[PDB]
Design a protein around this nucleic acid. Structure first.
Lengths: 226, 106, 94, 96, 83, 94, 106, 98, 84, 226
DNA sequence: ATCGAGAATCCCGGTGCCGAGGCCGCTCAATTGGTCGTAGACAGCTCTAGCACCGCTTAAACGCACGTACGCGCTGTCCCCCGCGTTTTAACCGCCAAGGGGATTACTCCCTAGTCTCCAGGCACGTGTCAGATATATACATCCGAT
DNA sequence: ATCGGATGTATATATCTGACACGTGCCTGGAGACTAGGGAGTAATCCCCTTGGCGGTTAAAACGCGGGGGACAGCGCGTACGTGCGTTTAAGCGGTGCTAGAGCTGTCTACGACCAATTGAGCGGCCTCGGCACCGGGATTCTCGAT
């Protein structure tokens, strides 16, 4: 029922500034923060920041302070993101993700992303790639740098699609996710476990910590079914 | 040996005291056994949520003790907690900093 | 001395497990005790009212869950139901 | 000499009193007013020290939350001064 | 004990201006102070009447802070911090 | 058909001793039944709270009188106290 | 057998109100004069509302009370309007009230 | 020359008309369809009594009439006679809904 | 065969909102009042119907009775007389 | 505490209009109707009309409809009554009285009374004048015309003073009234009873009905001590 | 400021109808009569805490002067909302037909109240130390007038 | 726009106190174990009442259009409120004392819960007629445009 629709693909000029919307409907707009995630195929996913449409309260990644500002529009249910002074370190896919103001909640609903082209705690996923059969259990780990406590999410990302939430609060299943996926762990050692694999389990599996102030994703794990 | 119902449930809130308060509180003629477990878990969740947001508000003020100002900032900076505690005054809590745009000078 | 029986030591245990280095003042502990008493007597009154509406004599966890869904706004009522269901599931496994 | 323009010290005081948590009424005039209002209901009453503080917290919270609605009523009429008509509208919409 | 009269002027014009500053008010008319004193007197009459009813139900002569908390709670003005 | 048990016949007796030639409609009788149930539930809940606040376990006519003085405004709570005092006084004379 | 309603001089059921107090989860025990007091207060309030509604029905030349007359009786009275301020009376309408600035001028 | 009332005459006439009636001012079937459409997002395959939708319509029209009575005061306060969405928003956030 | 309705908020027409404003005492009505009013009514009905369905599904019913609506209104401070 | 401050004495010529205030203090002004009663030495007490400051709603005697006109001012806490076409039949004292909107209630408190000097149910008080000793039990009857169901009051009026309420609802004592006074009766024949007399019981005693919409007083009963 | 035409509302008799109001049978809830056991009324006592007074310091209140900037009234313009006529659309009402599910009954059993015993969890009471409150100097930000 | 003086506020350092976090005894309330009984879960049946469909009426809705009046913006004028300065006045704080009353304990008894037997009060069903909704026709009242 929740849609976060976004723009099309763009190619722009350096030095300019691009503004992209996150027209979001299907829910009460002012009660959920809207998170912005940057995905380049070199550095994985990176968290830009959020805005809270209740009080227009923002928070940014310190490496994006000045590079990106977020604004709101409560009449049109729209959050805008401007990137100014476009360098070559700006050709990525920018998703907007809805997240509740609950500390337990995760980035549960994503936007499809915009192709943009120009002219601290580290999450170390131990398997960088997996290969398995169609009835095998796989186990992905998300070794942490400092003690977060259960504030870990697990996302899968199919090729050229927006990521999908699997686990939040390190054990709890997301909405509509089948019980084959199960999370475990606390502190610094977490685990994703898929039980009886299928053909549609071929994706990259990221772990996101949101216990501390800059949210950091994992490097990724490409699981290969046959 | 005697084990607490809080430890049986994994809680920090007293399931036995909440059972006695539901029994001696004129709520129903009978009280089920999972009612104080559920109610202690919900109360501990809500206490932990407002306490964590108040502790973050204290840390952003470079303090290590929660005072009522941090509870007020935590509650009024949150849409759901403000809908829950809308007709509630917090003593020595103050207000949120908010000036209307028209009153600021050109 | 007649044993005034607060929630203060449980709120302090919860605080020490979410923020192990942060303390709390006495006025803030009094506010948190009033908060916990208030939400107790709101959920208990709504569960009492549900049992009286459905001609039941028992307040159970199903009444407490319906009272939590009626009283708490949004995803507060989504995570509080998860916490209560987890505690009841753990408790009946002894 | 130096002279701030009208509206500058007002905004400075808005930022000063919206950052503090103090009681903005003096304690002894409010306690005398409470004991004077309570004379009409019972003679030779007696108050705890905490009852008058609970009354002062609630009274200042009521007046601050009313002045916010009064400010919205003044701004709606394209003014920046608040007036008794703004107070009366703010209380009529709230239902007092 | 002695009877007190006209203590509503102890809520001075600077105190009302401080409450308006906390309410975000930049400019205040001169007729606001008597309207504010009347509003505060009505609110305090309504709360103190209920607190005194709660007090003399208990056959007490002292208005405790709990009677004020109950008298506010039955008006939708729930106050945290005093028991 | 299991005896839904309203207040309609007592409200009709009251109406026929107040206005002996005026009748009532069914929707108005339902509104008056809702009104009588409403004020019963308000006075009984305030009396329940007054008994709980004073560590008492009995609702008496002193609790009902204090609840009437708390819930009814002005000179409603003056004449309703007189009505209740008159009824309790002539009831104790059997 | 004599009813407690006849013993108290009332038309409202003292015994039924006694049962509803005893089975309503209000207190652990219920005194003898409490259903008498509560029945007298409910009969007083029902009689006041019904008298004002019957007067308002007679003013519209009708011999039967409809919800409009109950609404007019309640909202044309400050004490009853403060008692029933958060109450919607079904098919009651509103009081006739136009602001003075909306009328034609001269 | 056809007769023509001046603007404001017929409006005051139907203010006096609809402030004298007690009836329901929304059509019954569009309101019933709106109620059943809204309830589809909470539980699928719900049934409603005939009096449940009547109770919802009475409550909804009492809400909207009581909100227009406050919107009108907010419009008159701004020295207007037209009501506007900023008047509705002011009334709703002083009442505590925005 | 299940009836799934879409966009019946336009069934509350412009002359219906004008009648509600006439009972409210309103003489002149802006043209943007109707879309504001439809959103206000939709938010009110979402809030009441959510509680009425919660009261209904607690009782393990499939029918929303009038008492569920009356209880859902009553704990929002909107007591309704006339329906039990 | 409840005071209804009225104006002073006044001389006017015929053909004039005169407005007299009824500034009220010590209570919530809008909750109580303010009643107007005239008193002549040729006809006695007579009810003119009331005004309810809550909805500015008046109701007049049919003998005074058009003649007298009532207006309130809520910010002033003041009720103004005007007299049009001042005839010779306007030589009276005009009292303003406070009555609640409760039907059981009576004219609770009265004003000072203003001497204006130009230049149906009937109540039957059976003793028109009475002599009594200083310790004798007195009964005064107030037989009615139509049936009023216990909506009857009793007032004591000293010479050149305002009337004081004794008994309302035909049995119930007023505030501050000692239990020497005692009322009885229901239907048409009512009775006032004074148990043991005193020095300050030298007054005239009126009975006022509220059963029907023109309120009618009694003729009077002049009581003398020894 | 009169004044007639037209539209609107009010009133006044006459008809039909269905909903209020009353009666009848029955059942179940209130009454009546004892019996018991706890709640609370009342007397008494102690100690807390609330009230009252007093002196001193000083911060806030008060009163006044000056000027500005904001409230308010006036005028003009234009555009948007209202009144009305015409065409269309969908509500509504009456009728009918399934069938889902609300409501009630019967029965079994498991879950909770009640009682008693024990012991450990939590509270009152002390106690040290460190987080915050405050003083004070210093640095940056901002406001305002002159350019 | 820019620059500098003045003012205010954020920042870093010392230092000091009282409040908070912790330790200890003790006592009372929670846990454990056991028993009895009744609430509710579940199955089964019935019959109401909700949903769906259909067709003709007709009243409401939609749409278009002319125009007037109201919203809004600009402009000017005056007055009232803000800023600041100097004088005054209570608030706050500390220190002390006195006593009223809150809070607690103990004892006793009246009062309400409870249980069983009985009967009449109230509720469902049904039946009838009159209060009211509606219809048609005249009567008054209000509005609006030439005069």
């Amino acid at each position: 029922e929740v849609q976060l629709q976004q723009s099309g693909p763009e190619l722009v000029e350096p030095g300019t500034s691009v503004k992209m919307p996150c027209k979001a409907s299907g829910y009460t707009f002012t009660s959920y923060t809207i998170q912005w995630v940057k995905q380049t195929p070199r550095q994985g996913l990176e968290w830009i920041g959020y805005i809270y449409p209740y009080n227009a309260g923002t928070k940014y990644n310190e490496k994006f302070k000045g590079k990106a500002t977020l604004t709101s529009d409560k009449s049109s249910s729209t959050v805008y993101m401007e990137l100014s002074s476009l360098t070559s370190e700006d050709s990525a896919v920018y998703y907007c993700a809805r997240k509740s103001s609950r500390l337990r909640s995760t980035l549960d609903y994503w936007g499809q992303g915009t192709s943009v082209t120009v002219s601290d705690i580290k999450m170390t996923q131990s398997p960088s790639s997996m290969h398995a059969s169609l009835g095998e259990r796989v186990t992905i780990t998300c070794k942490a740098s400092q003690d977060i406590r259960s504030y870990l999410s697990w996302y899968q990302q199919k090729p050229w699609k927006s990521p999908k939430t699997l686990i939040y609060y390190a054990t709890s299943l997301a909405d509509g996710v089948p019980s084959r996926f199960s999370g475990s762990g606390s502190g610094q050692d977490f685990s994703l476990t898929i039980n009886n694999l299928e053909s549609d389990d071929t994706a990259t599996y990221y772990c996101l910590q949101h216990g501390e102030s800059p949210y950091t994703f994992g490097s990724g794990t490409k699981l290969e079914i046959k | 040996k005697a084990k607490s119902r809080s430890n049986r449930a994994g809680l920090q809130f007293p399931v036995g005291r909440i059972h006695r308060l539901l029994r001696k509180g004129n709520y129903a003629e009978r009280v089920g056994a999972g009612a104080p477990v559920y109610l202690a878990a919900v109360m501990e969740y809500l206490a932990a949520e407002v306490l964590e947001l108040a502790g973050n508000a204290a840390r952003d003020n470079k303090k290590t003790r929660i005072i009522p100002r941090h509870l007020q900032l935590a509650i009024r900076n949150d849409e759901e907690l403000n809908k829950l505690l809308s007709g509630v005054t917090i003593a020595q809590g103050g207000v949120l900093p908010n000036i209307q745009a028209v009153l600021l000078p050109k | 001395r007649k044993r005034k029986e607060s929630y203060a030591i449980y709120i302090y245990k919860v605080l020490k497990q979410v923020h192990p280095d942060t303390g709390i003042s006495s006025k803030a502990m009094s506010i948190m005790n009033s908060f916990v008493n208030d939400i107790f007597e709101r959920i208990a009154a709504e569960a009492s009212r549900l049992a009286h509406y459905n001609k039941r004599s028992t307040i159970t966890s199903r009444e407490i869950q319906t009272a939590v869904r009626l009283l708490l706004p949004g995803e507060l009522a989504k995570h509080a139901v998860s916490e209560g269901t987890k505690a009841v599931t753990k408790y009946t496994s002894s | 000499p130096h002279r701030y323009r009208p509206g500058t010290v007002a905004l400075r005081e808005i930022r000063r009193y919206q950052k503090s948590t103090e009681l903005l009424i003096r304690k002894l005039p409010f306690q005398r007013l409470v004991r004077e209002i309570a004379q009409d209901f019972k003679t030779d009453l007696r108050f705890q020290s905490s009852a008058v503080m609970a009354l002062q917290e609630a009274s200042e919270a009521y007046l601050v939350g009313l002045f916010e609605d009064t400010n919205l009523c003044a701004i709606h009429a394209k003014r920046v001064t608040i007036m008794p008509k703004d107070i009366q509208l703010a209380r009529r919409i709230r239902g007092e | 004990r002695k009877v007190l009269r006209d203590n509503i002027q102890g809520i001075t014009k600077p105190a009302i201006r401080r409450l308006a500053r906390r309410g975000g008010v930049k400019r205040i008319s001169g007729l606001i102070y008597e309207e504010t004193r009347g509003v505060l007197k009505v609110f305090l009459e309504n709360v103190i009447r209920d607190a005194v009813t709660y007090t003399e139900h208990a056959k007490r002569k002292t208005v405790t802070a709990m009677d004020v908390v109950y008298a506010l709670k039955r008006q939708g003005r729930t106050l945290y911090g005093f028991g």
